[PDB]
Structures are given as structure tokens and as C-alpha cells.
Design a protein around this ligand. Structure first.
Ligand code: ZN
Lengths: 51, 286, 287, 191
């Protein structure tokens, strides 16, 4: 699908012959993913008071 | 419905090698096989083919056999090694349009909707292209039996491919009339094209031979086109077409005069570039 | 023994099979089978090649299914004519040609079947017209390399005619396999029917080529040909000056009027004369 | 085992169109074909059985295969209706017999007639001496109803086993709608 290789997208290559094998979606580096969903803190508006 | 076809040298040789590999039959055999390929943008394409096991006898010549086990298994193999590749139609070796080639297409029309045929040549000599392709219609006129399954020749050409041109141009090494200058058009269509008009000229002369002697259908659907030709014959030398011609050309030879006029100045400048080269070489070198 | 004068004959069709199937799945090392008559101790004549579909994704050579080649071997048996498997191939795509360690294994599985099996590498990128590049190979015994003994006993000035590539020389080249000089078999029965059919116009030069825009295009060249000739009235005048080698290196940033001029003179010339003569024949031929 | 390739010629003509035989003519000769391909298959795994007809349209309904399931599926709703043409049954048999897997195999055909024929004995004696020159051994088994005493058929099989052939057979139809298994019990026991 050579119509789908946009200027800007992220793709995979070959090591030896150096050809394009597969288009890929966008990625999210480790730092962010471990910024996303690591709070199991379940405090509520009931606990806070005064403001 | 389908505009034109594209034929590769791989299938083109790939009939002929089969004609060799049954060529030990000696007596009589036609090569019949299955044509494979795609078609896109209403442009027919042909990529691959093979041949079916096939025999025929002249006594009671309405009997034919296509091994559908060989057909299903080998096309299943070809689908497996290439899912992009698929069926496109068929071909027979086609010297002179054999009789079973009216319902071979009906035998295998359940595979391809526009199950197209290809007629080729095994003794190649002509002044044209020895590749033919018809298309099935069962068109209805307005007299006699209507629905008549008549094949109709769609135009044909040999298609190239960037992969196969390496092998084609490698297998030529023989003659190549490149440096297409003022000469290559003169021979690719001005010498040869008049002979292209010669055969189509002679063809209606050969059909014309029924004057009181030949076959039984007289004219009906042949002479409206011929009468249309003789009506469509062009204008004679009376008008401005002469003065527009004369007028036309007269403009073109101006540009010819300018171009030839500059060419001589170019070569003269090269002569000065030569003089400077040899003179300042004689006294310096010695 | 052999005399490095083996001289493989092949075909006129199998080259097309090798480039097509080697080209369609080109970044993966595709493969298939070779199929021809095995003539005498020196030569071999491999007339046909059918390919094999892959096993899975991955750049390698997969495997061989004797169910599949057992059936496909019999399809032509009950349809065309019997042949014999002689060799096999794979495809170093844009590499050149040698034997990998994976290649030498599946070769080694085949030489035990028939001692004169043939390894073949196609390279469907670095070929353009005269350079097809195949260079069929076969293993040599490393046992004799342990013996320190020279095999293959040249009796003919036929082997050392092509110099080996430096990359295959880096690879197993002369320590595990040898090259074979090959050529091709062809006939005028094929030569005519591929020559006479590849590039053929039909009745196209018997046309008039956009009769309004012919003179318009003629204008559309002459107009900038004027200013290009003004540049030719610019570029001559720095002669009787600095040396023409400096008038060679110095002209790699800006265009010259000379070559660019004599291009357009040719284009206008052959553009006009064809339309003139082809315009004038139809006056005679058509009424 | 022994080299042959069994080619059955079924009868889908328009005189195969009643329930005179007890289940169905179609099911009766169908199951007869099933047990004789059990006989040829279970006497020889090499034998493949495909079916042809000798009607107006002599179609290869099933390609010559050692399978039987496609044969069963096509014999389901086969629609046996159309004009018989026996004279092209010879060519549409023998040319497939040249299309077969190997000419080391014995050319054996069984042929089913359950309709009146309109052939010339000159035509089937040209095709019959054609099968003499082609060395072809066909045992023809008649079904249904027929012109009594196989008119031109005794002369055909006579001009098939003639000239030292003397081993081909012609099983005529008994015109009683009985169970056809004992009717064909003789060629399956000995050809
Ligand atoms: Zn490799």
C-alpha cells in the first residue's frame, strides 16, 4: 500500500537489504506510558474540605 | 466493455515452449491453455499461463476435454504462490480459429465473467502483430435468429514491465534501432505503416471475391461500412485546404530554416575550437 | 572428477521465470525448483523452472514440501512431458551472489540426492541490460581443503575466464564452492517473435499530432531559444581569457547555452520534419 | 493393482424419466455405479472413476477422479432430460480415454443404454472398427427399456470383440422393473 506511506509516518526497515517492510502506527516512549496510569489513589471530594 | 489488453513476453514465450513440448506429436495438435492475470481500470492484463491436457479427433470434431482436476489444483497452486494472481481467460494456439472455440468459452465461462481468449502464432511471419484477442457477445441484430454468440476482436498490444525488460533486452543483443532521430518514425510507421495499409487494403479485396463465385451471404452487414468509407473519402484539391496547406507548410519550413541556420554556426564554432587546439599545439609540442 | 569446463546450458524461459518470481517477492529470499534434462558429466540443460511458495514471513529460504513438488512434478507428467529435477535456486536480492551458511545447508541436503545438483542465485536488482547476473554454483568438499589438495584439475582453457567478485571472494568463494560458466540457448523461432512484437506502433505515424498545438509548441520552444541564444551571445565572450580547464570546472553551477542549444535544434528539427512528411503522404494516398 | 482406469458412461437422456424401477432409475443405476466403483476401487486403488453422458450435451460432470463424493453430488439433481446421442458417446468416451493418466492402463468402459437409439450400424461399425484399430475393450450394459434385442448392439459388440478380441460383452436389459443389482451381478463377478 504505497499510497498510504505519508511523508511523516513511522515505518520499519530491513537490516541487510534495507527495504521498507511494514508501516507502523505512532509510538509512546516509556516515560509517558509510565506517566499515564500509575496512580491508584482513590481520594474523593468528600475527603477534601474547606475550599 | 473492456478497452484493450496487455500481454507479456513471459506468456508469449510460455505458449511456444508448450508447443515445443507437445511438438513431438508430429501429426496434429493445437495448444490450448488457461490464461491468468488481472484487469484494472478497464485495461486487461495478462501475466501468467499454463496449458491443459487436451486432445481432439477430426472425425466427430465436436468433442473436447479440459481436465478440471488439473485446472482446480494447478490454479489453486498458483493462487497459493501468488494470491494477487488470478484467472483472466484462456487461449488457444490459433492458426485459423478452430470450431470448438465457440463453446470452449462456454465451457469455462463459469470461471471468469469476461472469459477472454487469445489467438497466437507458432509460425511467426507477418507485417503486423501476431497476437489476437476476441470477446464474447451474443448480440442481437434485427433479422433472423437474434442472440448470436459472435466473438468480437478487441484491440491488442504487447505490454512491457520494468522487471521483464531487463530479460527481454538481455535476450535480444541482436539489433536495436534506437537513436530515434529523424529516421525511426520513417521506418516504424512511414515505410512499414503503408504496408500496414496494404494488408487491410488487400483484405476487403479478398472478401470481395464472392462476386458470383464465393460464399452464400451476400452483404447486409458488410456494405454499410464500405459505403461509409467511400462516402468518407477525403476532400479533393480545390479549396483553401490547398492554400492552408501551402499556407500551413510554409510556416513550418521557416522553423526548419532557423534551426538549420543555427546548426552551421554551432559546428563552425567547434571548428574554431579545433583550430585553437591544433595551432597552439604544433609550436608548443613540436 | 571435473575439469572446470562444465558449461551449463539453460533456456530462454527460465531466466524470465527467475526474474519474475525473484522480483515479485523481492526483499524476501524467494526460491523454487529447477527442471531439465541431465546430459553428460560436463554439461547440463535445465529447460524449465517452477517456483515454490514460502513457509512464513522472514528473510531466509524456508523449506521444501515433497507433497507439493510430488504433485507439481506429476501435473506436467500427466499434462505436458516428463522432465527431471536437476537444480534449485534462491534469491540474494540486492546482494550480488554467494552461498550463505543457510544456503550451503539446503544445498547439502540436495547434493546427497544427486551428486550433480546445481545451486543458482538470481539478483534482480543489479541487472540492467547486459548484466543479468546469475553465476550458478556447487559445493566443494572441505575434506580436500583439510588435505591441502587442489581439486577440479583444469584440462581446458574455459574455467578462468570470468574473474570472481570480491564479495563472493569474501564469502566461501573458493573454499567451499566453485563458479560455473553458463550461456543460453535460443532460436530465430523465438528471436523473431520477440523482436517483431516488443515495441511496435500500429498506424500512429499515419496521424497528424495535435495540429493546432504543433505550431504552438514550435513557438513554445523558439521563444526561450531566443534568450538561450542571448546566453550564447554571453558565453562566447569570456574566451580569449582564462584557460578552458577553468572554463570546464567553472561551469558546474550554471547552464551552458551550447549543449542546451543543440538539444533544442534537434528537437525542433525532428519534431517538424516528421509532421511535414507524414502530413504530405496522406494527400496522395487518400484521394 | 492391475492397470486400468474405469470410465462409466451414465444415461441422462429423456427416456430415463419415470419410476418404473422401484426407488428410482437414477438411484438404482446410481447405487450400481457406487458398488462397481467399490469393486474396482477395492480391487485396485489405482483405478479412478469419472462419469460422462451420451445425451445431447456430453458433459464431463465429474473429472476422472478416485473420489466418489463429487460423483454422488452431481448424481444428486442430475436432471436426466434431453435427447440421446449415442454416436458421439464413442468419441466422448475414447478421447477422454486418451486424456487418462497413463496408456499403460487397460482401456475399459462401461456404457449404459436406457433409451431408443437412432444410430446407423454403418456409423457404429466405422466407430467399431475404429475401436478395433485402437484396441478398445468396452462392455456395454443396457438399462431401463430399449428397442428389444439391442438393435445394432450385438453387431457393435460383435465388431468390438471380433478379430481375436472375443472377450468383450454386451449385457442386455431384461424388460422387467426389478432390482438391478442381480441384473449387474454377472459383469461384477466376471467381465
Ligand atoms: Zn542466499
Amino acid at each position: 500500500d504505497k499510497s498510504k506511506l505519508k511523508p511523516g509516518t513511522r515505518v520499519a526497515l530491513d537490516m541487510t537489504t534495507l527495504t521498507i517492510m511494514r508501516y507502523l502506527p505512532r509510538e509512546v516512549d516509556p516515560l509517558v506510558y509510565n506517566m499515564s496510569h500509575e496512580d491508584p489513589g482513590n481520594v474523593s471530594y468528600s475527603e477534601i474540605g474547606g475550599l | 466493455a473492456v478497452q484493450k489488453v496487455v500481454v507479456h513476453p513471459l506468456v508469449l514465450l510460455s505458449v511456444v515452449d508448450h508447443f515445443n513440448r507437445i511438438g513431438k506429436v508430429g501429426n496434429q495438435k493445437r495448444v490450448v491453455g488457461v490464461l491468468l492475470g488481472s484487469w484494472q481500470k478497464k485495461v486487461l492484463d495478462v501475466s501468467n499461463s499454463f496449458a491443459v491436457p487436451f486432445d481432439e479427433d477430426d472425425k466427430d470434431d465436436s468433442v473436447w476435454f479440459l481436465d478440471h482436476d488439473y485446472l482446480e489444483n494447478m490454479y489453486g497452486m498458483f493462487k497459493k504462490v501468488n494470491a494477487r494472481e488470478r484467472i483472466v481467460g484462456w487461449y488457444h494456439t490459433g492458426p485459423k480459429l478452430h470450431k470448438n472455440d465457440i463453446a470452449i468459452n462456454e465451457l469455462m465461462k463459469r470461471y471468469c465473467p469476461n472469459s477472454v481468449l487469445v489467438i497466437i502464432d507458432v509460425k511467426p511471419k507477418d507485417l503486423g502483430l501476431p497476437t489476437e484477442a476476441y470477446i464474447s457477445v451474443e448480440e442481437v441484430h434485427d433479422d433472423g435468429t437474434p442472440t448470436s454468440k459472435t466473438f468480437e476482436h478487441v484491440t491488442s498490444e504487447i505490454g512491457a514491465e520494468e522487471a521483464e525488460e531487463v530479460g527481454v533486452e538481455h535476450l535480444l543483443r541482436d539489433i536495436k534501432d534506437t537513436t530515434v532521430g529523424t529516421l525511426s518514425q520513417r521506418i516504424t510507421n512511414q515505410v512499414h505503416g503503408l504496408k500496414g495499409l496494404n494488408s487491410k487494403l488487400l483484405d476487403i479485396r479478398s472478401y470481395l471475391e464472392k462476386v458470383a463465385t464465393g460464399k452464400l451471404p451476400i452483404n447486409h452487414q458488410i456494405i454499410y461500412q464500405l459505403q461509409d468509407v467511400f462516402n468518407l473519402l477525403p476532400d479533393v484539391s480545390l479549396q483553401e485546404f490547398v492554400k492552408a496547406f501551402y499556407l500551413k507548410t510554409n510556416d513550418q519550413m521557416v522553423v526548419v530554416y532557423l534551426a538549420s541556420l543555427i546548426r552551421s554556426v554551432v559546428a563552425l564554432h567547434n571548428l574554431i575550437n579545433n583550430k585553437i587546439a591544433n595551432r597552439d599545439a604544433e609550436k608548443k609540442e613540436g | 572428477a571435473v575439469d572446470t569446463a562444465e558449461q551449463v546450458y539453460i533456456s530462454s524461459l527460465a531466466l524470465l521465470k527467475m526474474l519474475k518470481h525473484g522480483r515479485a517477492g523481492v526483499p524476501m529470499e524467494v526460491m523454487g525448483l529447477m527442471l531439465g534434462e541431465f546430459v553428460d558429466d560436463y554439461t547440463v540443460r535445465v529447460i524449465d523452472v517452477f517456483a515454490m511458495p514460502q513457509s512464513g514471513t522472514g528473510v531466509s529460504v524456508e523449506a521444501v514440501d515433497p507433497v507439493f513438488q510430488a504433485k507439481m512434478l506429476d501435473m506436467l507428467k500427466q499434462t505436458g512431458r516428463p522432465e527431471m529435477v536437476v537444480g534449485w535456486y534462491h534469491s540474494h536480492p540486492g546482494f550480488g551472489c554467494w552461498l550463505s551458511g543457510v544456503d550451503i545447508n539446503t544445498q547439502q541436503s540436495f547434493e546427497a540426492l544427486s551428486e550433480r545438483a546445481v545451486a543458482v542465485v538470481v539478483d534482480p536488482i543489479q541487472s540492467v541490460k547486459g548484466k543479468v547476473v546469475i553465476d550458478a554454483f556447487r559445493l566443494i568438499n572441505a575434506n580436500m581443503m583439510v588435505l591441502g589438495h587442489e581439486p577440479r584439475q583444469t584440462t581446458s582453457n574455459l574455467g578462468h575466464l570470468n574473474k570472481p567478485s570480491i564479495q563472493a571472494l569474501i564469502h566461501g568463494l573458493n573454499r567451499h564452492y566453485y563458479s560455473i560458466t553458463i550461456n543460453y540457448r535460443k532460436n530465430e523461432l523465438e528471436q523473431k517473435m520477440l523482436l517483431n512484437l516488443h515495441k511496435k506502433s500500429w498506424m500512429e505515424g499515419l496521424t497528424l499530432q495535435d495540429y493546432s498545438e504543433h505550431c504552438k509548441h514550435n513557438e513554445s520552444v523558439v521563444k526561450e531559444m531566443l534568450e538561450l541564444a542571448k546566453n550564447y551571445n554571453k558565453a562566447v565572450e569570456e574566451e580569449d581569457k582564462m584557460t578552458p580547464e577553468q572554463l570546464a570546472i567553472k561551469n558546474v553551477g550554471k547552464q551552458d547555452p551550447k549543449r542546451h542549444l543543440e538539444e533544442h535544434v534537434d528537437v525542433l528539427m525532428t519534431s517538424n520534419i516528421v509532421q511535414c512528411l507524414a502530413a504530405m503522404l496522406d494527400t496522395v494516398v487518400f484521394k | 493393482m492391475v492397470l486400468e482406469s474405469t470410465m462409466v458412461c451414465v444415461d441422462n437422456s429423456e427416456y430415463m424419466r419415470n419410476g418404473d424401477f422401484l426407488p428410482t432409475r437414477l438411484q438404482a443405476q446410481q447405487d450400481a455405479v457406487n458398488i462397481v466403483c467399490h469393486s474396482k476401487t477395492r480391487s485396485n486403488p489405482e483405478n479412478n472413476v469419472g462419469l460422462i453422458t451420451l445425451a445431447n450435451d456430453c458433459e464431463v460432470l465429474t473429472t476422472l477422479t478416485p473420489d466418489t463424493g463429487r460423483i454422488l453430488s452431481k448424481l444428486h439433481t442430475v436432471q436426466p432430460k434431453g435427447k440421446i446421442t449415442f454416436c458421439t458417446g464413442i468419441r466422448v468416451a475414447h478421447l477422454a480415454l486418451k486424456h487418462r493418466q497413463g496408456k499403460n492402463h487397460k482401456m475399459r468402459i462401461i456404457a449404459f443404454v436406457g433409451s431408443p437409439v437412432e444410430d446407423n450400424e454403418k456409423d457404429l461399425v466405422k466407430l467399431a472398427k475404429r475401436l478395433k484399430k485402437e484396441k478398445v475393450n468396452v462392455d456395454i450394459i443396457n438399462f431401463g427399456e430399449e428397442e428389444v434385442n439391442t438393435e445394432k448392439l450385438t453387431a457393435f459388440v460383435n465388431t468390438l470383440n471380433g478379430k481375436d478380441g472375443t472377450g468383450s460383452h454386451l449385457v442386455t436389459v431384461p424388460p422387467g422393473p426389478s432390482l438391478a443389482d442381480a441384473l449387474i451381478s454377472s459383469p461384477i463377478l466376471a467381465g
